[PDB]
């Protein structure tokens, strides 16, 4: 665009880290830890390269079940490291779907998805839960009728 405007993320380079000595990004509260796994799950569902891989069946008939593991390995970064950023999540999204769809994807579609995973941690930190709550409702229509729209893309 000819001028700066608001967007779906901070700057696609945001990250999150432990408070001071937590040694992990996993929360001290059961509500913050559980809502974080739900929020990361909804971010893998807005990813285009995954959505077309299960619809065109680039892999086995279990393609609708493989998408449940792509969110699990992303949450696994938060329980094994004291910091995670949108940069090491990007390669984890790519390599995980390459191992189940052989897409070799290079469309950069994982960049806005990787930073969306970072936003879930900050939404669980202020107990506002605004992002995990809304995506859970907007997701129900994506599976009951396979509804989709191109407005998920950046404003350019």
Curated annotation (Swiss-Prot):
Keywords, A to Z, come to: Cytoplasm, Nucleus, rRNA processing
Assembly with partners or alone: Interacts with RPS26A.
Q: List the disulfide bonds.
A: none
- Domain of life from the UniProt record: Eukaryota
Q: Name one GO cellular component term.
A: nucleus
Nucleus among the record's keywords? Answer: yes
Q: What does this protein do?
A: Required for 20S pre-rRNA processing.
Protein's cellular compartments: Cytoplasm; Nucleus
Tell me, in one coarse class, where this protein mainly resides: cytoplasm
Other known facts:
Present with 13400 molecules/cell in log phase SD medium.
One annotated GO molecular function: ribosome binding
Q: What's the protein called, per UniProt?
A: Pre-rRNA-processing protein TSR2
- Asked whether the keyword Acetylation is assigned, the reply is no
Q: What lineage does UniProt assign to this protein's organism?
A: Eukaryota, Fungi, Dikarya, Ascomycota, Saccharomycotina
The UniProt similarity line reads:
Belongs to the TSR2 family.
């Amino acid at each position: 665009s000819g001028s700066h405007m608001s967007t779906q993320y901070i700057d696609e380079t945001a990250f999150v880290q432990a408070e001071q000595g937590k040694t992990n990004l996993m929360f001290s509260d059961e509500k913050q830890q559980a809502r974080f796994e739900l929020g990361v799950s909804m971010v893998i569902y807005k990813w285009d390269a995954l959505d077309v891989a299960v619809e065109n069946s680039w892999g086995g008939p279990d393609s609708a079940e493989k998408r449940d593991w792509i969110t699990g390995i992303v949450v696994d970064l938060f329980k094994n490291e004291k910091v995670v950023d949108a940069a090491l999540i990007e390669e984890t999204l790519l390599y995980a779907m390459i191992d189940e769809f052989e897409t070799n994807v290079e469309d950069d579609s994982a960049l806005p998805i990787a930073v969306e995973v970072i936003n879930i941690y900050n939404d669980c930190f202020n107990l506002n839960y605004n992002k995990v709550e809304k995506l859970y409702l907007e997701w129900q229509e994506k599976q009951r009728t396979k509804k989709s729209k191109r407005v998920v893309h950046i404003e350019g």
